Design a protein around this ligand. Structure first.
Ligand code: HEC
Ligand code: HEM
Ligand code: HEM
Ligand code: HEM
Ligand code: HEM
Ligand code: FES
Lengths: 49, 39, 62, 241, 81, 379, 379
């Protein structure tokens, strides 16, 4: 009975299930071919790909 | 003196008490399955 | 006469308070590994065809 | 002081202690929502994250999602996007705004359906028999045009036109679509939306009992062990007197 | 135990004092004081000042050595080549 | 005390206020509610904490966020349910902890009683404010009623209310306050508690017969420490069994709807443990006089020690003094269900009747009951 | 003790831990920082509170709300400025309160010292987290640096960080936490404080000469109570004069801009009292080894009592042992300004030099200094 509940509380702080869904969402499969392509925005930042 | 008496076999176990404890305390390598261990 | 299972047990384990502590740890160790596995089947055997675990077989890998 | 009837308690596949929900029926139950409730009543609080709860496998859900979604996506490079991407979205609302909602409803306000199970009194049975019951107005009673007489509803005049007739739809399964069969299949769905943890929690509900059977006697074993010295007392008064 | 009773043993030590009214709040504050400040300012100052002095030099020196390096680019390498 | 480890840090000699604290021999289970308050208090603060980390105080946000807990947070649903139901299992203890107070005449301890009174009076405030935080429908109007009620004061009333609200009504800044209060305030209760327990260590506990127990005492460590643990265990089920199978049973408020100031719910009540107080109020037609009773409802507990009318402490030996006492129990129990009913002439009259009876028992009958029995036994 | 009102509630005999606590006669003003910590602590919690009532924790809201305080709330500008500057006037006390510790050799009290160490170590945590709350630019990046630094741990590092963040980065849920911590945590400091003061009552204070003062003691009520008040008064100006005329002077961070994760400010530093610690870090090129020093920076304070190397407690009588000590002062003072400078080569070398010297003074020279002088005086 000890280990579960302790492991249950600590399982509250660690990670949301919503944010985890927002981790690495860029799947690609589009771009623009050759040397210009297009772009995206992964974990907050966004540049060129 | 120093005669280290059964305190040594005492401590020796106690050291092995917590060592298993952490493994039990935590999980990690879950440990070579050795009687059920989920996938 | 041979000592009853306890009479042995007490001399081997519960005497030294170290072992008396240690045995407890390994005890709960194996305990949760077997115990939890049984509890599912009992529950799962109650609900059949009400869970994807069974239901998912209709559509899984097409 | 309208007489409020009570929904008679029906059996429920989840009614029992350790009873669970039927996922199979839920798939239908969701299908209805996308069909009918899409008109007015929305659900803000749920994502497409459903995956294995309603059994939709992640692949199926993705395609299931990527039809539905959202508008626009070009507002000077700031905004959202078409075709949701991952499941992250919530469910698209039919209305931009409470006013545009109310306007088409002829002054009526469709409530949110997310937790509406736990909101109204009477539990889910309220809904089912409500959608069930539509009667003929008794002799000597009048109503407004939109308002329809239904006994369960508190004022017994409702602006909801009855949605259901026999076989409004076809099911992904193909089970015949019945006003009774259709209705219940929904009234299971909502019950899942109001507590998605449902089927998960009762595990402990069982699993804590099997745990707890041990302790109470065991602890009660020790208590009498310690005290056993007190309850064994004997006194005697031996004065030199 | 209790604090004041048992503290320590002292013998034949006599004490005198006056009411705070009889006497003054400033028994030659400026006159008797201002020398007293000095004689006790110098006893430490030998032991205190020197280390801080070292700091201030480093600070000044540090900035200058810093300045020359950055501010003047055509210093070591002038713009010829 | 040779190499006894209990001296060496001093702080442990302060920790022999527990272990060797001598106690009576015979103690009914009714004295276990000493501990079970504490543990119901601790179990809050933690479970009270890990809610805070995901909660947000805003008129726009707050309700959305509570949605966000039950849905998206791993193990997020248990905690919210432990916290809320951990309140009700707190009072049901608390009342009993008063009940033992009267019926054995423990109030004879004169100071410890009083600090008892305040310590109650605070909780009722805390367990209120938090109940606003979800910002649901029953929280909004249930907020206006209680506060706006306070306007009854003859002159400063009109200002004093508007002060707390920080405006004309219950919009934002009225919320943010009631978060920052409901957060801090339990710590103060924990502060007083370690005072409320203090004076007790001087005179020791009372014991069921109402007799000076001096000749018979027992170490506190081997014996009662188990019994509290055993006591501590039965709580969990009574907490778990409720919070796990049947979440909303005692969760009697049915209203999760986001508060709309325009609409009004047909029936409005506090949660259960308050009702009887709120029932007292409806009785008095006169507004101002009405409020006083509600304030005077609890405070009378402080005046009880003046009314000790007899020569023996317990009520276990006084049949009369016992006879009445139980009628008072149903009398309260009556009030509970009364307030939980609409205001319609079969009910209306009843509450007015039960109201007077309530005081009449405490304030007249019981102090008289002791007088006769002194006369009976020839005292 | 006939009708002495100090017994009757017991709690007041606990309150003769102050009034008759005997003290030395001669006490320098340097012992006033006993109190002035406490009052700087209380004055927080209040002024720390009335900020909470209008603050809101959200990524969207928070910064807007702090705007909302300085603008729209009656007397809203003083409080925010008392709170923030009430932090700096807290440390400037605190350090002195350690300084007196060494130079008179008060650390000889072995337990009270340690609890001293922790009690420091906590504050540095609190006065950190709050500094995130405004959610300004210097708060955002100054958050990432400190935390992400902790990834140095060989294996569990990568997880342990992501745990606190509750995600991949410093977005919302990382904020909400650091409110709920920075709120509660001071109360714990107040908890320890009443322990940290306890052990002291057993042995009494030390006194400047480093001599057992037994023969000469004084009541605490008529005398030192004034002197602390006088001490308590000079703070206010030093607090007011700063907070009133020159708000932003010690408010050295210039950055109110709403945090943009994309941009980066050219220079990034903690506020002042941290710098020297952060300066230690830049020295070590090796990352992991670098972190340890920073952790090992303070902890050495715990090991000092092992190094008492001489036969007399004070440093007022040891010229050498006094000579070095002051060099350590400038040495710290050096570090401060060093970290506050860019990492060009004139500075770079310097910090590396001052780093070694710092430890060399504490860990080698000072313990040696006492040895010689024992030998000198013929001890
Ligand atoms: C014709 C548009 C429309 C359709 C389609 C529709 N609803 Fe209704 N429904 C309404 C409106 C508008 C109300 C509230 C009107 C009122 O309360 O007077 C309502 C009432 C309700 C209520 C009760 C609201 C209350 O006040 O308690 C529920 C529950 C509900 N609908 C659910 C459903 C379900 C389930 C379906 C699918 C069978 C559905 N709605 C389809 C328009 C619709
Ligand atoms: C005696 C102690 C406490 C009591 C009686 C108490 C009672 C309550 C109650 C009755 C509620 C409303 C229940 C609900 O809305 O479901 C509540 C909510 C809350 N409490 Fe407490 N609480 C206590 C301690 C704490 C503590 C110590 C904290 C913070 C550390 C805390 C934080 C909260 C929060 C954030 C909420 C809103 C969450 C929510 O209501 O869903 N509470 N509390
Ligand atoms: C959070 C609130 C409270 C806590 C934590 C608390 C805790 C305790 C504890 C631990 C004891 C010692 C065990 C015992 O004597 O039963 C005690 C004793 C007592 N408390 Fe409280 N109690 C609380 C509320 C109250 C209240 C509200 C009252 C009265 C209004 C009260 C009156 C008493 C009395 C009279 C005793 C001593 C009775 C006896 O020794 O026989 N307590 N309390
Ligand atoms: C030792 C005690 C405390 C210290 C050292 C401390 C320190 C700080 C610091 C350094 C800040 C950031 C200053 C600023 O942003 O201008 C801050 C902000 C804040 N503190 Fe504290 N604080 C303490 C106690 C408290 C308490 C007891 C509370 C709540 C009752 C509190 C609530 C806040 C809040 C809400 C903020 C954000 C307001 C703001 O930063 O403008 N603090 N505190
Ligand atoms: C919030 C933090 C602190 C508070 C409230 C505090 C408060 C006090 C007070 C009121 C005293 C009695 C007056 C005095 O002896 O000067 C004291 C004594 C002392 N404190 Fe602390 N102090 C704090 C931090 C520290 C720290 C960080 C240390 C060491 C690392 C420390 C070490 C000592 C020592 C050694 C004494 C006794 C010195 C002597 O009696 O001569 N204190 N403290
Ligand atoms: S960690 Fe990126 S600069 Fe030091």
């Amino acid at each position: 009975a000890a280990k579960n509940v302790v492991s249950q509380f600590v399982s509250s702080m660690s990670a949301s299930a919503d944010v985890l869904a927002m981790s690495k969402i860029e799947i690609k499969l589009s771009d623009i071919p050759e040397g210009k392509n297009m772009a995206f925005k992964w974990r907050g930042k966004p540049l060129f790909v | 003196r120093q005669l280290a008496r059964n305190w040594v076999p005492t401590a020796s176990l106690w050291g092995a008490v917590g060592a298993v404890g952490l493994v039990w305390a935590t999980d990690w390598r879950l440990i070579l399955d050795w009687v059920p261990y989920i996938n | 006469v041979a000592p009853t299972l306890t009479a042995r047990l007490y001399s081997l384990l519960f005497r030294r308070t170290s072992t008396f502590a240690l045995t407890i740890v390994v005890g709960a160790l194996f305990f949760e590994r077997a115990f939890d596995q049984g509890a599912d089947a009992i529950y799962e055997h109650i609900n059949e065809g009400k869970l994807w675990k069974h239901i998912k077989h209709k559509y899984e890998n097409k | 002081s309208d007489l409020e009837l009570h929904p008679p308690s029906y059996p429920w596949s989840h009614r029992g202690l350790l009873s669970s929900l039927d996922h199979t029926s839920i798939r239908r139950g969701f299908q209805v929502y996308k069909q009918v409730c899409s008109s007015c009543h929305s659900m803000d609080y749920v994502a497409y994250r459903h995956l294995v709860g309603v059994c939709y496998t992640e692949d199926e859900a993705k395609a299931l999602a990527e039809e539905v979604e959202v508008q626009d996506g070009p507002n000077e490079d700031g905004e959202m996007f078409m075709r949701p991407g991952k499941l992250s979205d919530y469910f698209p609302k039919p209305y931009p705004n409470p006013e545009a909602a109310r306007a088409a409803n002829n002054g009526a306000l469709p409530p949110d359906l997310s937790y509406i199970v736990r909101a109204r009194h009477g539990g889910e049975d309220y809904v089912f028999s409500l959608l069930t019951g539509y009667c003929e107005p008794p002799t000597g009673v009048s109503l407004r045009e939109g308002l329809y007489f239904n006994p369960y509803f508190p004022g017994q005049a409702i602006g909801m036109a009855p949605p259901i007739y026999n076989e409004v739809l076809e099911f992904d399964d193909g089970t015949p679509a019945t006003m009774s069969q259709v209705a219940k299949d929904v009234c299971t769905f909502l019950r899942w939306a109001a507590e998605p943890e449902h089927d998960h929690r009762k595990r402990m509900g069982l699993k804590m009992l099997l745990m707890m059977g041990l302790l109470l006697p065991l602890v009660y074993a020790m208590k009498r062990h310690k005290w056993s010295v007190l309850k064994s007392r004997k006194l005697a008064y031996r004065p030199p007197k | 135990g209790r604090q004041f009773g048992h503290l320590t043993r002292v013998r034949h030590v006599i004490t005198y004092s006056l009411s705070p009214f009889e006497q003054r709040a400033f028994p030659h504050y400026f006159s008797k004081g201002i020398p007293n400040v000095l004689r006790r300012t110098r006893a430490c100052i030998l032991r205190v000042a020197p280390p801080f002095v070292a700091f201030y030099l480093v600070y000044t020196w540090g900035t200058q050595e810093f300045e020359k390096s950055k501010r003047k680019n055509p210093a070591a390498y002038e713009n010829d080549r | 005390m040779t190499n006894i480890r209990k001296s060496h840090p001093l702080m442990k000699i302060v920790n022999n206020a527990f272990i060797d604290l001598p106690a009576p021999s015979n103690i009914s289970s009714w004295w276990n509610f000493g501990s079970l308050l504490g543990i119901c208090l601790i179990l809050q603060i933690l479970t009270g904490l890990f809610l805070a980390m995901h909660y947000t105080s805003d008129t726009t946000t707050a309700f959305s966020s509570v949605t966000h807990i039950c849905r998206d947070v791993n193990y997020g649903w248990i905690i919210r349910y432990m916290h809320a139901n951990g309140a009700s299992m707190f009072f049901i203890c608390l009342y009993m902890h008063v009940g033992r107070g009267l019926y054995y005449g423990s109030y004879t301890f004169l100071e410890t009683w009083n600090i008892g009174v305040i310590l109650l009076l605070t909780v009722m405030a805390t367990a209120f404010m938090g109940y606003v935080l979800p910002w649901g429908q029953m929280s909004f109007w249930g907020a206006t009623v209680i506060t706006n009620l306070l306007s009854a004061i003859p002159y400063i009333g009109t200002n004093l209310v508007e002060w707390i609200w920080g405006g004309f009504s219950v919009d934002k800044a009225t919320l943010t306050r009631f978060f920052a209060f409901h957060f801090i305030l339990p710590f103060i209760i924990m502060a007083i508690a370690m005072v409320h327990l203090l004076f007790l260590h001087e005179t020791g506990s009372n014991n069921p017969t109402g007799i000076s127990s001096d000749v018979d005492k027992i170490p506190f460590h081997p014996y009662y420490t188990i019994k509290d643990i055993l006591g501590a265990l039965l709580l969990i089920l009574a907490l778990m069994l409720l919070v796990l199978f049947a979440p909303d049973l005692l969760g009697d408020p049915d209203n999760y709807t986001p508060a709309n100031p325009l609409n009004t719910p047909p029936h409005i009540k506090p949660e259960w443990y308050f009702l009887f107080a709120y029932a007292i109020l409806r009785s008095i037609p006169n507004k101002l006089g009405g409020v006083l009773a509600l304030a005077f409802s609890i405070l009378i507990l402080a005046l009880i020690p003046l009314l000790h009318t007899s020569k023996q402490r317990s009520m276990m030996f006084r049949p009369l003094s016992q006879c009445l006492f139980w009628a008072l129990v149903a009398d309260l129990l009556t009030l509970t269900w009364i307030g939980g009913q609409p205001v319609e002439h079969p009910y209306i009259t009843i509450g007015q009747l039960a109201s007077v009876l309530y005081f009449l028992l405490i304030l007249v009958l019981m102090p008289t009951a002791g007088t006769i029995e002194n006369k009976l036994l020839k005292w």
